[PDB]
CSV table of C-alpha atoms and ligand atoms in Angstrom, one decimal:
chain,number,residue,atom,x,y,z
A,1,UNK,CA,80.1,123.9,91.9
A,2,UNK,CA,83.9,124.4,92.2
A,3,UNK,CA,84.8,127.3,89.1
A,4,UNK,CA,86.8,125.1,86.6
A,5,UNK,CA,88.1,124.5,82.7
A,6,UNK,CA,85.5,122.6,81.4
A,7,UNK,CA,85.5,119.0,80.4
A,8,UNK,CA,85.7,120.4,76.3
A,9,UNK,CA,88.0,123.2,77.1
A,10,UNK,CA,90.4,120.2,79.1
A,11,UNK,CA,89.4,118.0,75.6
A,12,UNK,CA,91.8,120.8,73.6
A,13,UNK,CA,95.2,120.2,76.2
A,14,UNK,CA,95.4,116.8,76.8
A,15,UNK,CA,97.5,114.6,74.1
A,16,UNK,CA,96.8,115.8,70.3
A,17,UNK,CA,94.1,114.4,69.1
A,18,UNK,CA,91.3,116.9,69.8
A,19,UNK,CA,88.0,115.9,72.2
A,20,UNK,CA,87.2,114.6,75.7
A,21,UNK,CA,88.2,111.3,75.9
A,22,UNK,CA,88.5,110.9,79.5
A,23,UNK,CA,87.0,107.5,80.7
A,24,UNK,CA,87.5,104.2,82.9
A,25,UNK,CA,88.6,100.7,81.6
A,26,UNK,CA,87.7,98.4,84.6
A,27,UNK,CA,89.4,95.6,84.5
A,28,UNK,CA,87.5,92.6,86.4
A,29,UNK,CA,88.3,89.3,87.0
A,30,UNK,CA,90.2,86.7,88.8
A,31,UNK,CA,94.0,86.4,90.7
A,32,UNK,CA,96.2,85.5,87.7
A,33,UNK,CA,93.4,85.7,84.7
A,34,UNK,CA,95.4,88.1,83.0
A,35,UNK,CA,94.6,91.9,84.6
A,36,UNK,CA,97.9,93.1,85.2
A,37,UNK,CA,99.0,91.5,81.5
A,38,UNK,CA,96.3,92.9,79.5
A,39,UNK,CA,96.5,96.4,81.0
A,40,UNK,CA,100.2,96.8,80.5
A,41,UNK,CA,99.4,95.7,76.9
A,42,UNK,CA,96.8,98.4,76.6
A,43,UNK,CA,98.4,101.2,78.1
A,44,UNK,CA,101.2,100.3,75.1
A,45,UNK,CA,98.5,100.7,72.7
A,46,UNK,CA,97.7,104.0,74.0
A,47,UNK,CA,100.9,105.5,74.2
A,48,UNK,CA,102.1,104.0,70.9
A,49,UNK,CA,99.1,106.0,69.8
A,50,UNK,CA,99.4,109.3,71.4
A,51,UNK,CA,96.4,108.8,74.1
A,52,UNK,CA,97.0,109.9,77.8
A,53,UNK,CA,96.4,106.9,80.0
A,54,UNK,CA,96.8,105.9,83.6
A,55,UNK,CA,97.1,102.7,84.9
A,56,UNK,CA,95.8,102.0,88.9
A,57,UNK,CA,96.7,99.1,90.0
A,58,UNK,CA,98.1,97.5,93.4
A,59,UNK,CA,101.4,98.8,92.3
A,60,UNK,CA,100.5,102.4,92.8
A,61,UNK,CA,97.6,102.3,95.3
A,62,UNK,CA,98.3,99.2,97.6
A,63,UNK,CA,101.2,101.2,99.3
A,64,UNK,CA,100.2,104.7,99.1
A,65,UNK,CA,96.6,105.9,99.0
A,66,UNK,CA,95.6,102.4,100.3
A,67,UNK,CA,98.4,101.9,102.7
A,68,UNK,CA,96.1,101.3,105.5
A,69,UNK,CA,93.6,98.8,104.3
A,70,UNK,CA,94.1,95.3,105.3
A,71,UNK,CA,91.6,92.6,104.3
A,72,UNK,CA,88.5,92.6,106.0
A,73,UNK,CA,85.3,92.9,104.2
A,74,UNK,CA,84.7,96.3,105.2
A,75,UNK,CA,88.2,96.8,104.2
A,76,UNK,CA,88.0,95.5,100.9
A,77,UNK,CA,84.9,97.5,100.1
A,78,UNK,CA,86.6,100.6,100.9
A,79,UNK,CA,90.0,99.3,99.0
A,80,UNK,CA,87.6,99.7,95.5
A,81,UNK,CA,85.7,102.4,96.8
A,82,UNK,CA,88.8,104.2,97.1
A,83,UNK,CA,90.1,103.4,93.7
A,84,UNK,CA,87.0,104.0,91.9
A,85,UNK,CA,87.1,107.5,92.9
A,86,UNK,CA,90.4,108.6,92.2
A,87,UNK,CA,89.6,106.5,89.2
A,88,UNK,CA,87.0,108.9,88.1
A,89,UNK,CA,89.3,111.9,88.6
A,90,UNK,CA,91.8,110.6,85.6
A,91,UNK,CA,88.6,110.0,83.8
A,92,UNK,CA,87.6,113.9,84.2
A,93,UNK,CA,91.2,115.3,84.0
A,94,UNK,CA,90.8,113.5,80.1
A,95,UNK,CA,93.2,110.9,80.7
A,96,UNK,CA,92.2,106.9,79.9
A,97,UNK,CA,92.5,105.4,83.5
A,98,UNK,CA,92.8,101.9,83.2
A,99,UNK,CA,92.2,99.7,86.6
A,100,UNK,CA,92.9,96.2,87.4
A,101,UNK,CA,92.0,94.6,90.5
A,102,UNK,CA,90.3,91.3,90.9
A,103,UNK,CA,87.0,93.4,92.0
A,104,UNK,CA,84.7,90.5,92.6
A,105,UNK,CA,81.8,91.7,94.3
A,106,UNK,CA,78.8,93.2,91.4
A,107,UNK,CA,78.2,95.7,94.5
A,108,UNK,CA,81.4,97.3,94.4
A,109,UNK,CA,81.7,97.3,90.4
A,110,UNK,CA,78.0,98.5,90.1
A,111,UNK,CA,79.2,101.3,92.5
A,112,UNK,CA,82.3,102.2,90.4
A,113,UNK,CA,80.0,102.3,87.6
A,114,UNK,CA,77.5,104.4,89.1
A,115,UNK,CA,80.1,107.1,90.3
A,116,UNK,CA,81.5,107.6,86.9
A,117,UNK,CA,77.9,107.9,85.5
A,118,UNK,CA,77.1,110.7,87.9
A,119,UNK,CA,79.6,112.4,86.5
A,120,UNK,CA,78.8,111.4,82.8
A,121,UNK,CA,81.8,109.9,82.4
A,122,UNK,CA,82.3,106.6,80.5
A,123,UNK,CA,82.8,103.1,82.2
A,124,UNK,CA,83.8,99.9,80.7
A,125,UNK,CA,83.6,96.8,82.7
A,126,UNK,CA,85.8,94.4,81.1
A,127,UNK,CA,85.2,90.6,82.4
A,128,UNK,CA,88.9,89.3,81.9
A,129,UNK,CA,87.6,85.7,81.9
A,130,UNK,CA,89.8,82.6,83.0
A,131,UNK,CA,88.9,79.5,84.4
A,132,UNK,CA,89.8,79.3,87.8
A,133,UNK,CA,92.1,76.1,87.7
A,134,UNK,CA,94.0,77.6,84.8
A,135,UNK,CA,94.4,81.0,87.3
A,136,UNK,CA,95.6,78.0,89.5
A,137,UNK,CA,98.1,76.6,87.7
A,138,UNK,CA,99.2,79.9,86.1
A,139,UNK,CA,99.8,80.9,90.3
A,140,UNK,CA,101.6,83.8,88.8
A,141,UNK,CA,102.7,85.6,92.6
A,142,UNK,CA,102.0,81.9,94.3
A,143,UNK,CA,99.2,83.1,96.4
A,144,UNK,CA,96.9,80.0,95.2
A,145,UNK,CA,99.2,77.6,96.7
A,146,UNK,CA,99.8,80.2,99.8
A,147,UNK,CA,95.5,80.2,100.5
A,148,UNK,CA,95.5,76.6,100.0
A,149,UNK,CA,97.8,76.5,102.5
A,150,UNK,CA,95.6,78.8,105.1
A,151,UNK,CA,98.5,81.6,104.8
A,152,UNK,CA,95.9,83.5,103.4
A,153,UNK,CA,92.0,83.6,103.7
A,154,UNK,CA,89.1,84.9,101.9
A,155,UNK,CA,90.9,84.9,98.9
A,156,UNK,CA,88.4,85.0,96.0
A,157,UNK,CA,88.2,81.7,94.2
A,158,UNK,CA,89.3,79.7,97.4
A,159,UNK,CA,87.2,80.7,100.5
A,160,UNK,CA,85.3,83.6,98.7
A,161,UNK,CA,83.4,84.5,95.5
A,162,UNK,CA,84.3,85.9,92.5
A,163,UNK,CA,81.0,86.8,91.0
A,164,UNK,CA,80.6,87.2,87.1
A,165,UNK,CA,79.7,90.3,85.6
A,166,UNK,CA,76.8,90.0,84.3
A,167,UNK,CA,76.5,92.4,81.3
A,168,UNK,CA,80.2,93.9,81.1
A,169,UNK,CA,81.0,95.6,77.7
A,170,UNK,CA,83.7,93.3,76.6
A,171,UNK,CA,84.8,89.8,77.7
A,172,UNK,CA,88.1,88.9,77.5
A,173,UNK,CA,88.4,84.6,77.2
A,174,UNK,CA,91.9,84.6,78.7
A,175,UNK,CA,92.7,81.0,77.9
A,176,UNK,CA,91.4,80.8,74.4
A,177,UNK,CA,93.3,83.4,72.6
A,178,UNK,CA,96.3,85.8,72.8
A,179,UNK,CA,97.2,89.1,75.1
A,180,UNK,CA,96.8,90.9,71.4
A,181,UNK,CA,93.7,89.4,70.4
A,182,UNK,CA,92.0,90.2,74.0
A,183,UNK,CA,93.1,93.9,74.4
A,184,UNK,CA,92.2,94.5,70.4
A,185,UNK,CA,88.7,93.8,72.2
A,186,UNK,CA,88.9,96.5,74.2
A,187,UNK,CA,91.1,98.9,71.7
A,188,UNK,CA,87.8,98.0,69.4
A,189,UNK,CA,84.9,99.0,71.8
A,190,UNK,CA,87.1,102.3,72.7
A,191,UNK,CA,87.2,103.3,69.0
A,192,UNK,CA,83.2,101.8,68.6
A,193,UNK,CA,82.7,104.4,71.7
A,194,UNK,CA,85.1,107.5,70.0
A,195,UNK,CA,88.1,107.1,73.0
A,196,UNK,CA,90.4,106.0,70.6
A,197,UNK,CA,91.0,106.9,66.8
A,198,UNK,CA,90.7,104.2,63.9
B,1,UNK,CA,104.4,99.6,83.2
B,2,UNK,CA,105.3,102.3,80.3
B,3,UNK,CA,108.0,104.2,81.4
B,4,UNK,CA,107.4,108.0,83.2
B,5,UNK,CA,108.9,110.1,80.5
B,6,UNK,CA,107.4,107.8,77.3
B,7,UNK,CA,104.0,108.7,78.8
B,8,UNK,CA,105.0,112.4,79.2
B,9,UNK,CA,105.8,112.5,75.4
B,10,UNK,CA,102.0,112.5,74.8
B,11,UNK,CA,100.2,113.9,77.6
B,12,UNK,CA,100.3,117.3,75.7
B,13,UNK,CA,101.8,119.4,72.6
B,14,UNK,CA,104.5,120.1,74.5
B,15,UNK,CA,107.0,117.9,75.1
B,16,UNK,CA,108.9,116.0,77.6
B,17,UNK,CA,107.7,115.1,81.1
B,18,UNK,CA,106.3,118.0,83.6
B,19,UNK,CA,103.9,116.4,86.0
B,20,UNK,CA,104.5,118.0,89.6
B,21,UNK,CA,101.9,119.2,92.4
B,22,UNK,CA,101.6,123.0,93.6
B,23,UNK,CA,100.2,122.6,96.8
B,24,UNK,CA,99.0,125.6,98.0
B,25,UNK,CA,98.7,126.2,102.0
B,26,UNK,CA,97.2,128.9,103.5
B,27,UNK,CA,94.2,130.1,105.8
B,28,UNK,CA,90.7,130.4,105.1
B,29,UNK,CA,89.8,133.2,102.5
B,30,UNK,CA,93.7,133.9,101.7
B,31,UNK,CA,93.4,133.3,98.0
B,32,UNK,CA,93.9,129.6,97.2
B,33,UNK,CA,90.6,128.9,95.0
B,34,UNK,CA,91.2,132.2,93.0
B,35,UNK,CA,95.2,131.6,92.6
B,36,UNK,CA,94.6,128.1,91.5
B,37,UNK,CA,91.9,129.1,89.0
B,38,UNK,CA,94.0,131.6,87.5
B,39,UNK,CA,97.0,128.9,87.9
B,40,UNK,CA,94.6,126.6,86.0
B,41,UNK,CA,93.7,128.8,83.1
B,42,UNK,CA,97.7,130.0,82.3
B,43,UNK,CA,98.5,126.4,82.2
B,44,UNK,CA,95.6,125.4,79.8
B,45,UNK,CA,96.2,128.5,77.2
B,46,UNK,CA,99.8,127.5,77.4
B,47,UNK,CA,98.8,123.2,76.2
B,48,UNK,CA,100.2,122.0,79.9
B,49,UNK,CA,97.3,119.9,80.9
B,50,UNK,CA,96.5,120.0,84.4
B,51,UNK,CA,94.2,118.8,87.2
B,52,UNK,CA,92.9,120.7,90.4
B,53,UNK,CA,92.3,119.0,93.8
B,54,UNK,CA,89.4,120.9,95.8
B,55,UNK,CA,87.2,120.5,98.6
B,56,UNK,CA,84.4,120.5,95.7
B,57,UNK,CA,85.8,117.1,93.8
B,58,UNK,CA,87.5,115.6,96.9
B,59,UNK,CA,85.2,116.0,100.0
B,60,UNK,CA,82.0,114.3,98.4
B,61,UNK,CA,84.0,111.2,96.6
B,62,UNK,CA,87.1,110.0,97.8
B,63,UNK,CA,87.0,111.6,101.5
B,64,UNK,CA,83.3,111.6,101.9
B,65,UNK,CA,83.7,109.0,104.8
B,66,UNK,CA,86.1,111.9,107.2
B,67,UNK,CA,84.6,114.7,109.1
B,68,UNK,CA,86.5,116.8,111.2
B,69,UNK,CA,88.1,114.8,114.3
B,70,UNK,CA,91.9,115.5,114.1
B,71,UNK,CA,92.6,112.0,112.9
B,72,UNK,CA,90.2,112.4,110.0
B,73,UNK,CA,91.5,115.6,109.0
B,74,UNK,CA,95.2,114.0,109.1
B,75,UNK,CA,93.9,111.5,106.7
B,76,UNK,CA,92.4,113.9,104.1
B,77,UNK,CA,95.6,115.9,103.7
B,78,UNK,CA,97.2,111.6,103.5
B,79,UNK,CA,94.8,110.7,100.7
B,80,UNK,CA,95.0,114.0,98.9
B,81,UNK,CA,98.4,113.9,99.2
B,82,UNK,CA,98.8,110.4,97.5
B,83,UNK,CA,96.6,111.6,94.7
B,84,UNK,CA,98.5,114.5,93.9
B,85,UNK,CA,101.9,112.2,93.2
B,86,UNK,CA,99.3,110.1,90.7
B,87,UNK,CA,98.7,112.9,89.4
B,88,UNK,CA,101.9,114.0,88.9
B,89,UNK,CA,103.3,110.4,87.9
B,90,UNK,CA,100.8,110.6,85.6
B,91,UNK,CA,102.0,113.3,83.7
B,92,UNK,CA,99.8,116.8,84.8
B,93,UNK,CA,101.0,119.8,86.8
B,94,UNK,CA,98.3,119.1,89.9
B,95,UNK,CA,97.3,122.0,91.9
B,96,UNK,CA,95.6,121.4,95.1
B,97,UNK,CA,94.1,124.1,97.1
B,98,UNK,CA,93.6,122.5,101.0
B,99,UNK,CA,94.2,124.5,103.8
B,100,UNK,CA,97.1,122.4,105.1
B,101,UNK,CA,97.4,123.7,108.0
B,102,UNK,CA,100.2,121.4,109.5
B,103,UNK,CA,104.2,121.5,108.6
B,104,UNK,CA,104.0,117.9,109.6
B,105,UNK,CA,100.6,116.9,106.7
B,106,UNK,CA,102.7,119.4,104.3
B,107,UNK,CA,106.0,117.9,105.0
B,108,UNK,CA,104.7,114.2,104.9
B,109,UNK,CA,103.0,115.4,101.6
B,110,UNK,CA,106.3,116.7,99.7
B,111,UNK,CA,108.2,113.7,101.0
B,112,UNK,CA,105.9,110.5,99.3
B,113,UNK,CA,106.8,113.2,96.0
B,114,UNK,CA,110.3,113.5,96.1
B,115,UNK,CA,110.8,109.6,97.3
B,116,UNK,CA,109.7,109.3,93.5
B,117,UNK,CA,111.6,112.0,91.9
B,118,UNK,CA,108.2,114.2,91.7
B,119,UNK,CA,108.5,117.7,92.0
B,120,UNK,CA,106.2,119.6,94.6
B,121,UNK,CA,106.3,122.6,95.6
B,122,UNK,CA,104.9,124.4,98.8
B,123,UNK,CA,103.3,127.8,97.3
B,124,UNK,CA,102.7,130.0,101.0
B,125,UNK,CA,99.1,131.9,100.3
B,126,UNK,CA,99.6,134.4,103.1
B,127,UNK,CA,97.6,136.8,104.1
B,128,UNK,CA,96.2,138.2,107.6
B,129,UNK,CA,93.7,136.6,109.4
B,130,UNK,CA,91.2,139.8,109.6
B,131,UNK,CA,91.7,140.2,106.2
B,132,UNK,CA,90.5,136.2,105.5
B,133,UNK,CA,87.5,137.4,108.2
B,134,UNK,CA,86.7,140.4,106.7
B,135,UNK,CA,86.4,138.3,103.0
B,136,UNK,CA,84.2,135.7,104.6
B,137,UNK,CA,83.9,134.1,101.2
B,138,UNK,CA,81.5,131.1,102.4
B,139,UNK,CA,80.5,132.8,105.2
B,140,UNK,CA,82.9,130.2,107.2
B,141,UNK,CA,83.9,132.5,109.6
B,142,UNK,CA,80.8,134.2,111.2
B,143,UNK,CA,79.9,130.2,111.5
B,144,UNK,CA,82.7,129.3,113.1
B,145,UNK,CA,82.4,132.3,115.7
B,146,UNK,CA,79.2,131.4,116.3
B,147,UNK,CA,80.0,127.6,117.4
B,148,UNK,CA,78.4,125.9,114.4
B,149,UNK,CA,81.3,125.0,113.1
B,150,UNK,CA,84.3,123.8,115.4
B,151,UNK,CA,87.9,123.4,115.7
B,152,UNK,CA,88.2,126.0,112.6
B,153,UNK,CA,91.4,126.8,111.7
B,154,UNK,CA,92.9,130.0,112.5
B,155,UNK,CA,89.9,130.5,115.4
B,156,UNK,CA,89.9,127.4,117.7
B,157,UNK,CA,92.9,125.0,115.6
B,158,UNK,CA,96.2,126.0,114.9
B,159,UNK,CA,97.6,127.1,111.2
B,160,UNK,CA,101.3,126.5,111.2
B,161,UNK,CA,103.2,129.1,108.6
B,162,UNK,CA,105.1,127.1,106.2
B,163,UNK,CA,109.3,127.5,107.2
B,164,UNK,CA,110.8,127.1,104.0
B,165,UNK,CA,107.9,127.8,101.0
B,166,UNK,CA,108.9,127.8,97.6
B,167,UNK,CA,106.6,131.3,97.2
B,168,UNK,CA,105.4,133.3,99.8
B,169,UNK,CA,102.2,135.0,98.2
B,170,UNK,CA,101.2,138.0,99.9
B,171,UNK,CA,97.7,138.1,98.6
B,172,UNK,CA,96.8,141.5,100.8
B,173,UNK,CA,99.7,143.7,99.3
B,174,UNK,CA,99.1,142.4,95.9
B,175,UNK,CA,97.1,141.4,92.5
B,176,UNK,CA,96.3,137.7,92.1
B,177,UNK,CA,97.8,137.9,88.2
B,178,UNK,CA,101.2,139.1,90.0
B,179,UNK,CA,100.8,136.7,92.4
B,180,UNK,CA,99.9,133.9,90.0
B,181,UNK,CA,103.3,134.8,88.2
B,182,UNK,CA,105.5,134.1,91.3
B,183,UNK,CA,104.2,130.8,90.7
B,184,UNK,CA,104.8,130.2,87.2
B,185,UNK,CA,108.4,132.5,87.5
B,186,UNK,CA,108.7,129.0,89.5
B,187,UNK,CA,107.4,126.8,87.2
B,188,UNK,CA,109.6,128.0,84.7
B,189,UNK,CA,112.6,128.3,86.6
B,190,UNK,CA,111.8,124.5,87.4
B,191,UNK,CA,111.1,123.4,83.9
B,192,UNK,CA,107.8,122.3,84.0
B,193,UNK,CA,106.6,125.4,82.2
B,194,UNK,CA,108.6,126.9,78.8
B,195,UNK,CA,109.6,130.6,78.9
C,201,ADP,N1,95.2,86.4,76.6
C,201,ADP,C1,95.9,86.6,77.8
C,201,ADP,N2,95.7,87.7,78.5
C,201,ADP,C2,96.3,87.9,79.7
C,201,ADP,N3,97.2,87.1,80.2
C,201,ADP,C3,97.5,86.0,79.6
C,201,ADP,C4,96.9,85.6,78.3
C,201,ADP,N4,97.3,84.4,77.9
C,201,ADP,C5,98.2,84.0,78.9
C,201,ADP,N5,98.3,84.9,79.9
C,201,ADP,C6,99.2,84.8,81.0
C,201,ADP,O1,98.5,84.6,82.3
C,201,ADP,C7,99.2,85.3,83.3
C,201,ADP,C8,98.2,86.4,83.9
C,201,ADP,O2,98.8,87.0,85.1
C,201,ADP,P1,98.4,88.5,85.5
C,201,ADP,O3,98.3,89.3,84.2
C,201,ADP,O4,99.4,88.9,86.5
C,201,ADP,O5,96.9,88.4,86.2
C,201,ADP,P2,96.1,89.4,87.2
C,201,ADP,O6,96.7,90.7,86.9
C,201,ADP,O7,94.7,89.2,86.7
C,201,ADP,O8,96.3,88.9,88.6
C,201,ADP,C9,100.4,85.9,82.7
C,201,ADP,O9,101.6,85.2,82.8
C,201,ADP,C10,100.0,86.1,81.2
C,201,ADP,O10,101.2,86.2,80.4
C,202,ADP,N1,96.3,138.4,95.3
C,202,ADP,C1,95.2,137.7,95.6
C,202,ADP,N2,95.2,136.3,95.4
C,202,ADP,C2,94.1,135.6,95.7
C,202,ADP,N3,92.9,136.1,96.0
C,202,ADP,C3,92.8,137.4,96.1
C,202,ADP,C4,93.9,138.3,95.9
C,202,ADP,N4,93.5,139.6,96.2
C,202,ADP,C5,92.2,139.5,96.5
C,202,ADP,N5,91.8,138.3,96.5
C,202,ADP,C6,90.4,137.8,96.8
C,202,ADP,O1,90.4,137.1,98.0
C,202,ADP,C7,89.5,136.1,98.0
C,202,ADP,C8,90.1,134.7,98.3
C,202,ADP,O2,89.1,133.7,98.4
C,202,ADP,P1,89.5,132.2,98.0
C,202,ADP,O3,90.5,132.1,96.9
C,202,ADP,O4,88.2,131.5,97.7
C,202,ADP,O5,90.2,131.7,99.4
C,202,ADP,P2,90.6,130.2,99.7
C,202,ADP,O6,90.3,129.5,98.4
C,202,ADP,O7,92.1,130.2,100.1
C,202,ADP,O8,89.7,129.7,100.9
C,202,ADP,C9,88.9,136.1,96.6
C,202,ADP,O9,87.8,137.0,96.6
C,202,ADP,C10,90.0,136.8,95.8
C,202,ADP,O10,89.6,137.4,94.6
């Protein structure tokens, strides 16, 4: 062990409200179901309520820390791998890290998961739930009609699979309701789980 | 994305926005675990919420996958360096503690922070290279003589004294508390840290 503040000392410092609240939101799901949307959305939430957050997403990590990935398998494994770590240290520095890529492999989420649990830190995988011709028509950056085309492959939902979480702590029916019904799902389980203040 | 200053509003009591990364350099042994500790304890009693990078939470998660070929080590200092400027974009005063030993890593790592108007500052932990051998901390040294360990900077790899350091701390000729406060004289000078 590394000689540190501890995790309840750090609780004290970070934003007002007293106690560790460090954690990961995972956000999960496919190209255009509504990731990008419903983390902006929660990230509001938490500021509007005085709770540290960070927010990982291609944004901030594509061009920087994972500036030399491409999209190979191996690639792409290491691309999550990557995030989930840096992921974790937000989680242990106190802060809310929110993530959203498409992360469709259960292997890599059930690694992100297990890394945080290691380090007792909590994990919610959120399922953010669309149906994949509504992601289609939706084509938000136009990469559906682009891996159509063959400009892109092994793009999930096209030629590879997005496979469904199978017991994720919140899912998030994308087409059936609004951007403030689905994050008050999450804003719910992080109060249910003491993150987040009533 | 919420703006950088709204989220520096609440990352702690105080206000305003003071993420930034110290990034102490310096050879084996010269003091960069016990001034970052110390670092990390003035900023915590003072409500500045902060976040150290170590060998001990960065060399068994994020850079498991890099042992010590030059290539590898130029990728550590790359990764580390682009989690600092989260860090800092984020909010906390991040301290990391990595032998940098290369202008070019250090230089590389200052400019991805001021690209996006991130502070950083190069803090020089200098002191002699018989006095690092003589602390033998880990026991690093005695390995490295004895060929277990190669390519061990300041014995068979180069360190390369930073030109133009924000601090030189001469942690030979003095205490680490007066050494810590060159640090947070900066700090303060720089705003990130209330007088
Ligand atoms: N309940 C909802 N949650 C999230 N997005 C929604 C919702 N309803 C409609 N949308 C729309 O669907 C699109 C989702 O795109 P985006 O958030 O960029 O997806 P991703 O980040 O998963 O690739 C947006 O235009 C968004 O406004
Ligand atoms: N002014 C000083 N600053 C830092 N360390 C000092 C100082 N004076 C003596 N020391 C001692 O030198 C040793 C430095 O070891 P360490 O900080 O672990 O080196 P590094 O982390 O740079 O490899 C510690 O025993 C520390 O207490």
């Amino acid at each position: 062990q590394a000689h540190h503040v501890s995790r309840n000392k750090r609780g004290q410092v970070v934003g007002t409200r007293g106690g560790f609240r460090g954690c990961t939101v995972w956000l999960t799901g496919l190209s255009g179901a509504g990731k990008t949307t419903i983390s902006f959305a929660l990230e509001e939430y938490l500021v509007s309520h005085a709770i540290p957050c960070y927010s990982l997403d291609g944004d901030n990590v594509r061009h920087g820390l994972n500036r030399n990935l491409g999209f190979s398998p191996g690639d792409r494994e290491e691309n999550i791998r990557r995030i989930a770590e840096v992921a974790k240290l937000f989680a242990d520095a106190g802060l809310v890290c929110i993530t959203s890529f498409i992360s469709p492999f259960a292997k890599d989420r059930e690694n992100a998961r297990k890394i945080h649990e290691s380090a007792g830190l909590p994990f919610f995988e959120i399922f953010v739930d669309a149906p994949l011709n509504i992601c289609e028509s939706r084509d938000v950056k136009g990469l559906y009609k682009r891996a159509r085309a063959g400009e892109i492959k092994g793009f999930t939902g096209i030629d590879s699979d997005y496979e469904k979480p199978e017991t994720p702590e919140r899912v998030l029916k994308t087409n059936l309701s609004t951007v403030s019904d689905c994050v008050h799902q999450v804003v719910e389980l992080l109060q249910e789980q003491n993150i987040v203040p009533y």
